[PDB]
Amino acid sequence: IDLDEATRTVVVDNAGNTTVLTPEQVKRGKRLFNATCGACHVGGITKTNPNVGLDPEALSLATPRRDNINALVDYIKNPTTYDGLESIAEVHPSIKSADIYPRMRSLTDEDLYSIAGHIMLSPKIASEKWGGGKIY
Amino acid sequence: IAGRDIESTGFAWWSGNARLINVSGKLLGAHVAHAGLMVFWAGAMVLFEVSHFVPEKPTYEQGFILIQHLATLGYGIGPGGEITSTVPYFAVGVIHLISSAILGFGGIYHSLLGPDTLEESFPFFGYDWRDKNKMTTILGIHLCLLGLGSFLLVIKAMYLGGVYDTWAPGGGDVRYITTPTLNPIVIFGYVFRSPFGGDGWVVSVNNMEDVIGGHIWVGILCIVGGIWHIFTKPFAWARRAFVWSGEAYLSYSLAAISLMGFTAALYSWYNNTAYPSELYGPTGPEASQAQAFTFLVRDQRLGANVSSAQGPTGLGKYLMRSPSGEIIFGGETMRFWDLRAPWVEPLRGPNGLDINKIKNDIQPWQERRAAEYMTHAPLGSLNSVGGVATEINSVNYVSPRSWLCCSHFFLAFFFLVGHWWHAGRARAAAAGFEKGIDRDFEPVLSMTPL
Amino acid sequence: RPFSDIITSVRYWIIHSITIPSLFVSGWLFISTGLAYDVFGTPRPNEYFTQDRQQVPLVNDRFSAKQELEDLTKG
Amino acid sequence: GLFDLVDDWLKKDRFVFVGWSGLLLFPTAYLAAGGWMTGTTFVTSWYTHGLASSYLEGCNFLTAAVSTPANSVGHSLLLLWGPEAQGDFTRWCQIGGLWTFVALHGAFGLIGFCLRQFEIARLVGIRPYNAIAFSGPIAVFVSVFLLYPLGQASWFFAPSFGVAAIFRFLLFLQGFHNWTLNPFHMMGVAGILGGALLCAIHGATVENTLFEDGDAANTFRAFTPTQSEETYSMVTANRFWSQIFGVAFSNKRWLHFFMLFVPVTGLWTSSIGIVGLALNLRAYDFVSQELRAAEDPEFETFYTKNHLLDEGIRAWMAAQDQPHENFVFPEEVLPRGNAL
Amino acid sequence: VSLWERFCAWITSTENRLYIGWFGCLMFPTLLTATSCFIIAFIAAPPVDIDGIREPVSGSLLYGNNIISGAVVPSSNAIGMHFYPIWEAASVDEWLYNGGPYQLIVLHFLLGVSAYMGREWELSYRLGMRPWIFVAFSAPVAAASAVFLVYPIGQGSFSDGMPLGISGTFNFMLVFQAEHNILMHPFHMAGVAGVFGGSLFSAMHGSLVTSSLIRETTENESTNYGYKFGQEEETYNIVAAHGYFGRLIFQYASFNNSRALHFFLALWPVVGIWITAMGISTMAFNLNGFNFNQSVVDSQGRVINTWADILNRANLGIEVMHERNAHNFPLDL
Amino acid sequence: ARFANGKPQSIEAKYIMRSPAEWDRFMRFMDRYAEANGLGFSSXXXXXXX
Ligand code: CLA
Ligand code: CLA
Ligand code: CLA
Ligand SMILES: CC1=C(/C=C/C(C)=C/C=C/C(C)=C/C=C/C=C(C)/C=C/C=C(C)/C=C/C2=C(C)CCCC2(C)C)C(C)(C)CCC1
Ligand SMILES: CC1=C(/C=C/C(C)=C/C=C/C(C)=C/C=C/C=C(C)/C=C/C=C(C)/C=C/C2=C(C)CCCC2(C)C)C(C)(C)CCC1
Ligand SMILES: CC1=C(/C=C/C(C)=C/C=C/C(C)=C/C=C/C=C(C)/C=C/C=C(C)/C=C/C2=C(C)CCCC2(C)C)C(C)(C)CCC1
Ligand code: OEX
Ligand SMILES: [Cl-]
Ligand SMILES: [Fe+2]
């Protein structure tokens, strides 16, 4: 089995529209995610706050929905709590807190799009370990 | 070739450098060339790290080992441990490279074309391994040089731009140490205190004032000793307990340097003052304290009454009491209650961890620092997988503290072994039975039976 | 004849510069052409799973192992 | 006679001794080595263990192995012409016949090597102690690679010829049999460590009691093979060790016999223990302590902690170690301690 | 003739049944107190809390233990790396509750073995022999120091040291595997190679020497009786043994300078044990072995398990169970 | 315990009594070695002259 066209299609928006990630995008993401996100979100789990995981099920229950590329990209632009009552940009990496966190001082849009695509795509490949944890 | 063959010498090719014991000029050439090798490595590695530098990541995530030293000296570093520019590191690297070229040429010249023995032509640089006055003279000269170097560090920290101080008000930054501590009692309290937990023989220096004062004292002591050994001659009590030969001096130096290597290895693993966590990453205990702190904060946000929740064993899972009564973080990290970090001290009162400060006056930057330190603990693997041994390999990080400590501990023990070997051989050779027994004067046959 | 004498012989290297590289290149082409996958039955990186089965292809019987493997290794 | 000149040519003096034992030593040993070399390079373990064990699939030297055949096959010989494979080299490799090939050929090569030692001793006219010493490794191989899987369900539970596979075997036996608690293993480790001790101490003692037989610092060149007198002072070494330790050797023959004896008997005791494990007759529990802990939840020793570790390793390892059982353990079923 | 002189002389005498020497002045009292305390504690030491969670563990014979399960439990986790002599406790009972005897015994044992090395060298000097046996003995001393002192220093607590017992040793080894992956560390591999090679070379050297023994005895008398203490000629034939060894493997491959042979015998296990002690010391500061977890990936991206992943599975099984009540947070730092 | 401490003397009695042992040794050592100023052997670890 390959990383074919069927398995590279992910939700792009709330509606449900589904775009396709080019293989280059996949690579760049896996790189960017491992370089910046990996230290705390290795394996699709949140190391500091294990309750708020990164698996698609938890993203589906966040407020608002975080199970599509657009909402993940917006979350990077402007992060909120699990219920979305207030912003936690001062305690989470974000473009809004670019001054606080120097890592994002260079990230571009495509970079964010590729990172979100990787986050969306990895549970389609592994399908049980993205956010699973030790057990799996 | 007279001096370079197992016949003329009696030393095999593998132990070939021992042929230089009685050859003065060639030994000097070898020493100088080796020093040139050291300088070359320093310059080359600094240039390598500057080339592979990435401004996004902190230095302790890039696998760097030398930028941290020059940053601690106060070169191209801003408040909070941010790196501004990498030009001074490049300058240091190139200067070291050029000086290494000069030293290497000198070593080669003295090893190849230089006179084999310096005693005949230059009766000032010639020695005998057996007279004590010249040995003590050389020792005193180099001791004065070391004292001048310690002075130079003090001068750099006091009037040449200052040094980086983590405990500085408003965060870590470069400052001038205006008032170093000169009290002999406080300075030698480090030297004469216990090496066990809670004491930290010389590793437990806290502020920069103590560092500067200790260096002033070391420089003064080294200058005085260097002057004294130059003038005087070894006394009677030291004249009959020491073996006076080149290999014996080498063995003494080996023992001393093994002790120094052990000290530096354990010093890089525990110290936050001369090894700021913003450059070398958090220490062993620091990561554990950061984990306990960040989970305490997270559970406090939910509204749980911290310092009132009994742990699974009934001991208290957030706040405990130290065996001395101080209030500390609970869990397995109670073994690390001796920790003192710049981001946790604001919360400490005379009684320990103040509770009113924790409940009300918490800061977001402390949360970020604790999360970053917990996410970057001095854990890793030989292939630098990073994290716990059971973790999958996505991150790529091993803390420079681990590298420094492990490498220098290994080197220190093997130099202790070198001390054992060389001390034994030097004493046997001085006695005169390093080659065999005798077969006609076997001392066992002359001793009473038993 | 001792080893060193043979190793330093020129007539040895004139028969060890047309034999060794040829053998090395043949060993390279053994898997460059992909023959080794078929000879030993090891799966290629894209043959571990198929569209029909998404789990490990274990053998459960003994005297029908041939047919079972033939089926598993269908696609 | 035709037999006589053939025997003469077999015992011809050359670079390597062939002998009668060579006839089954060389082909069997060569085939075993070649089977291991091809196994860790091309053939896979996908269809027997659900693993990847080969350089072709991306494993390094530490992870490549020749894995045991599938558990569905029992203790079958997995002959290439057997009913399980019926020729067809590819399926023979896939179901795991290469493990049996390597094991059987290596065992016969091992027999050939012991026979070769006997024949060399007879030709040179010395006593055959070398074969008796080599009987130890033969016992270890027979007990671990042959008897243990034979006592178990199938060849699947024998150790696999690989670096990491042997580590898995170690951990598996510790978790399932409490092999460290077995007294025969304790005897084996005592024998092995004592052998290493004896080797190091004898080397140091001999090298540090050399006689003055030269004038150079290099003492290696003061020895000639055709020497009659002894090169080191037995008297001085004996006195030194009797003054330091309290007891010392005074008989070179007894010294070297002891050096022979220690590791061999260690290995033999370990082999007896492994043969015991093959039937699940393991020294697992201390009944008295197990009880007294069961009736009182305050009693604790390191022994009970080891038991907890064994239960954890067993429960967490069974699912992936034995894919043929189709073990499915939900998260709430797996034993786990606190937050960690 | 002064008194000091007379003493110094008796001390450095080589006619005493056991050599005292100046290093003996440190070795004897220290080892004697260590062994006295060990013998008493192995019989009648009360339970000790090792994890500092008020869950004492019994390790004494009089508390329902046997020889194998019994041990001298290391000091409490609450103490950590702090020095805990008798006089710092408020009562002897409390000192026993927090595992002070472990610290006492281990510190004295380390000083004693160091002084033992020194005494070996000193007697070598007195007897006029070449002084390198204590260099060989350094390897076990280094291993003991790494397992008893360096590892607690790196981990930050004396509770992490090896308990003085059998089952305690096994527990220490298993937890070390779980938390550090000792097996996949090249230094442990070097140590296993060194120990196996030491046993191999010991057995082979003994067999070769005993096989080629000059016939100087009957059949109804121990072969060992042919040799007489204080001989002047070799009781064994090097030529026959070397002929057998060369015919067994290869002609080139063989040692003749018996001195080189014995040096190699000394060199192999010693360097192996040194490298192993360095493995333990390096891993005390969390430089673990190779982690080849999920290294093999198919085209799609799914992970294909290797033999290393089953090792990780067993390590997880051990890890989630060790010190069940001690942990409160997800990471073991 | 963790109270730093010059050496580990906490009570003047402890220092004043760790004193006489070292001074006793100094005296017994001085008994042999006294009135020594010269006698330079000038050799490799000889110290032959008493
Ligand atoms: C830092 C390592 C070091 C140093 C400084 C030396 C130095 C020396 N060794 Mg030596 N040695 C070493 C490692 C070292 N060794 C090691 C590792 C071994 C074990 C293999 C030996 C084994 C050994 C033996 C057996 C002998 C020496 C001897 C000597 C001395 C004379 C060498 C000589 O005549 O060179 C002659 C060699 C050459 C002329 C060829 C080398 C050409 C140059 C020097 C190489 C470097 C060029 C450099 C890259 C160019 C830089 C130019 C600069 C302007 C930038 C000299 C003092 C001899 C001695 O005792 O002297 C009395 C001797 O007999 N050594
Ligand atoms: C400043 C430190 C220092 C100095 C000046 C010396 C000086 C000397 N030592 Mg020495 N030694 C030292 C430290 C030192 N030692 C230490 C720390 C040890 C403990 C291991 C020893 C152990 C030792 C022994 C056992 C012997 C000496 C001997 C000697 C003499 C001859 C050495 C020679 O020709 O080298 C020759 C150099 C070589 C052959 C190089 C060998 C390379 C080593 C084995 C591997 C290095 C690995 C390296 C870390 C990384 C490898 C990279 C690789 C993977 C590519 C000479 C006086 C000999 C003697 O007695 O002379 C009188 C002797 O027999 N030394
Ligand atoms: C002397 C060397 C030697 C030895 C001892 C063995 C031994 C073995 N090989 Mg083997 N092998 C060898 C050389 C050797 N091999 C060589 C050189 C090759 C390369 C061609 C192979 C290739 C090979 C393969 C490919 C396989 C083996 C296998 C085996 C094992 C089972 C063999 C079997 O059942 O047949 C036993 C055969 C005999 C006992 C025949 C002996 C000769 C008879 C007695 C002559 C008289 C018979 C007569 C004609 C019959 C009369 C009629 C009858 C009705 C009475 C066994 C351990 C198999 C294995 O291990 O699978 C797991 C397997 O598949 N071998
Ligand atoms: C005696 C002897 C020896 C030794 C020798 C020695 C040790 C030497 C050294 C040498 C050396 C130690 C050298 C060095 C050199 C250096 C150099 C030559 C440098 C150069 C530099 C440069 C060219 C630079 C450039 C640059 C710049 C300026 C900028 C940036 C870029 C770059 C970096 C490019 C041996 C062992 C061999 C053998 C025996 C004898
Ligand atoms: C810088 C600094 C510091 C320091 C300072 C100081 C001031 C130091 C010093 C140091 C010192 C001050 C040291 C000393 C040492 C000593 C020693 C180490 C000794 C040794 C000795 C010996 C080794 C001897 C031997 C012997 C004997 C015992 C017997 C007889 C013989 C003989 C003589 C051989 C501090 C930490 C504060 C802080 C930071 C900075
Ligand atoms: C099984 C089988 C068989 C057989 C086969 C063969 C016999 C093969 C062989 C093969 C071989 C016979 C192979 C080999 C290979 C080899 C190799 C692959 C090697 C490699 C090497 C290396 C890699 C090395 C390394 C090293 C070391 C070890 C040490 C030092 C360093 C170095 C790095 C050099 C037959 C046909 C009967 C058919 C049936 C099946
Ligand atoms: O104490 Mn003995 O084992 Ca070293 O990791 Mn943490 O702490 Mn406890 O857990 Mn895992
Ligand atoms: Cl914890
Ligand atoms: Fe021997």
Numbering used by the authors:
A (entry chain V): 1 to 136
B (entry chain C): 23 to 472
C (entry chain E): 8 to 82
D (entry chain D): 13 to 352
E (entry chain A): 11 to 343
F (entry chain W): 92 to 141
Verbatim from the authors:
One of the important factors responsible for the powerful vitality of diatoms is their extraordinary light-harvesting capacity, which is achieved by their unique antenna system, fucoxanthin (Fx) chlorophyll (Chl) c binding proteins (FCPs). Here, we solved the structures of a PSII-FCPII supercomplex and a trimeric FCP from C. meneghiniana by single particle analysis using cryo-EM, which revealed detailed structures of monomeric, dimeric and trimeric FCPs, as well as their binding to the PSII core.
The Cm-PSII-FCPII exists as a dimer with two-fold rotational symmetry and its symmetrical structure resembles the configurations found in Cg-PSII-FCPII and PSII-LHCII from plants. Each PSII core contained 22 subunits (18 transmembrane subunits and 4 extrinsic lumenal subunits), which have high similarities with that of C. gracilis. A major difference between Cm-PSII-FCPII and Cg-PSII-FCPII lies in the peripheral FCPs surrounding the PSII core. Among them, FCPII-I has almost a same position and orientation as that of Cg-FCPII-D. In contrast, the positions of other FCPII monomers and dimer only partially overlap with those of the moderately bound tetramer (MT) and strongly bound tetramer (ST) in Cg-PSII-FCPII. No FCP trimer is present in the PSII-FCPII supercomplex observed in the current structure. In the Cm-PSII-FCPII supercomplex structure, we assigned 206 Chls a, 24 Fxs, 2 Dtxs, 12 Ddxs, 20 β-carotenes (BCRs). Furthermore, two FCPII tetramers are found in Cg-PSII-FCPII, whereas no tetramer is found and only a dimer is present in Cm-PSII-FCPII.
